[PDB]
Amino acid sequence: TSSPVVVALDYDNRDKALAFVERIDPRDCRLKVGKEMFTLLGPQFVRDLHQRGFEVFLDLKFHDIPNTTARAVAAAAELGVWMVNVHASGGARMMTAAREALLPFGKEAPLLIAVTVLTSMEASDLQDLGIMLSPADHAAKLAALTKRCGLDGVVCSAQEAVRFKQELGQEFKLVTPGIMTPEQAQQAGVDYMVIGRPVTQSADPVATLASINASLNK
Amino acid sequence: VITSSPVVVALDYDNRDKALAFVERIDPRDCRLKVGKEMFTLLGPQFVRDLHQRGFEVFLDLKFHDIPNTTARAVAAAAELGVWMVNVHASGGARMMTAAREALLPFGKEAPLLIAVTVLTSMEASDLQDLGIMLSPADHAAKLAALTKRCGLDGVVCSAQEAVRFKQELGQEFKLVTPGIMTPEQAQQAGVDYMVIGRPVTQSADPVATLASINASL
Ligand SMILES: [Mg+2]
Ligand SMILES: [Mg+2]
Ligand SMILES: [Mg+2]
Ligand SMILES: [Mg+2]
């Protein structure tokens, strides 16, 4: 697909999940598999989506020692996923090890994206941890580290996309976490946008996606 | 059938047959098992079920680090899977750890031990500085361990080098899990409750005899 849309599958049941996926079409969007779904269903669920033609963002936010994170990212590449993420809080050596583990996969390597600051973190949450920079500023610091380590991009809200494209450049991918419309967020510089209930709770998911996609550059 | 051993053997295989060949050699009276990010990404929760069916208690070592509600749902998923221990990153902050604690309350005494990673064993001061953390690994770990205790979690992952300090500061009931210069016997002397051991057992010539030699010293 050339759509920048990535639909979040936040189901707690495999029946419902694949009932939705049956409705829509892989030519129209990609899919995100997060921590709960994966913990409940495992990589077989990812294989189910691949067998249905979809490209998948595996959103497990790996955060471990460098060698383990590298092996996990390589495991995800062996699963065939399109995108995988790690925590930039794991540090430069961890992010570098993950990048090097994907080198041999060549053009089959998933996009390797870092989480910087979680959307839930406020300054009071950060200060407990010894962090005195604001969420946005700490995120900018971790995003610069991510780029220096050669990763493909970061998870970044649409509200920070202009700042981050300016500071980090056009090639460095911005993926939203999942107020701007999709077209506004694309204008801000978002490369891939995660969309959840607007699509999965739509009475007509295909028509919701068709109208979203009609508003976006491809 | 519960082990008296404090040993938890890390299953870091890239192949199910090799892992289960190991698991068949050993016995659940002699150790617990740890399932981490690599094997869980390859095999998912069915692999945990296969270990349970063989009578083992399992440390599900996925180091959950996400927004509070997502981490809570993942921790509850692990509890429904029936695992013995599960961990989270203290770096996710207090509200995330509290959310995870609250998610386990409905599971009561069947809930897994809920343990926080503080500082990863791989991290040196220079790795932390890049993140804006100016404390030594040991002192940042102590800060995050205090926060973990204040949030009501059951213990932390901590090196044996810091166990005497942590038992003094945080008390006897607060569990210390080493991640794997101190011998198992010394680690136990220093107050370690559970010790993860990986390649020294799984990659040894004779893993059963290696594990026996470790248990004989404990
Ligand atoms: Mg690809
Ligand atoms: Mg046997
Ligand atoms: Mg046996
Ligand atoms: Mg238990």
The coordinates were experimentally obtained by X-ray
Cα distance between residue B203 and residue B15, in whole Å: 14
Residue position matching structure tokens 């998923």? B77
| For the CA of B211, the nearest ligand | 3
Return the residue in B50, B131, B139, B203 with the most chain A beta carbons within 10 A, the one to mutate for interface testing.
Answer: B131
Q: A97 is written with which tokens?
A: 């090890």
Distance B23 CA to ligand 3 centre (A): 7
State how far Cα A112 lies from the chain centre: 9
Q: In what order do the strands lie in the sheet with A173-175?
A: A173-175, A153-155, A111-115, A83-87, A56-62, A30-33, A5-8, A193-195
Count of H-run helices and E-run strands, chain B: 11, 8
Distance A69 CA to ligand 4 centre (A): 27
B94–A128 C-beta distance less than 8 A: yes
CB-based contacts of A93: which residues, under 8 Å, 6+ apart? A66, B122, B127
Q: What is the resolution of this structure in A?
A: 1.6
Q: Is A44 within 8 Å of A27 (Cβ atoms)?
A: no
Residue A44 has its nearest CB partner, among B44, B65, B94, at B44
Q: Report the candidate in A178, A187, A134 with the shortest Cα–Cα distance to residue A156.
A: A178
Secondary-structure class of domain B7-217 per CATH: alpha beta
Q: Where are the alpha helices (DSSP H) in chain B?
A: 16-25, 37-43, 45-53, 68-81, 94-104, 125-129, 137-150, 163-170, 184-190, 199-202, 207-217
The catalytic residue among B34, B37, B63, B149 is B63
Amino acid found at A127: Q
The backbone torsions φ and ψ at residue A54, rounded to the nearest 5 degrees and listed phi first, read -85, 150
Distance B112 CA to ligand 4 centre (A): 5
Which one of 3.40.50.12500, 3.20.20.70, 3.40.309.10, 3.90.550.10 gives the CATH number of domain A5-215? 3.20.20.70
H/E element, A105: none
Q: Is A212 within 8 Å of A24 (Cβ atoms)?
A: no
Q: Is position A35 annotated as part of the catalytic site?
A: no
Residue A85 Cα distances to A56, A70, A109, B42, B64, angstroms: 12, 11, 12, 16, 13
Which residues of chain A from 133 to 192 reach within 8 Å of chain B, CB to CB?
133, 138, 141-142, 145
DSSP bridge pairs for B9: B33, B197
The separation between the first and the last C-alpha atoms of chain A, rounded to the nearest angstrom, is 9
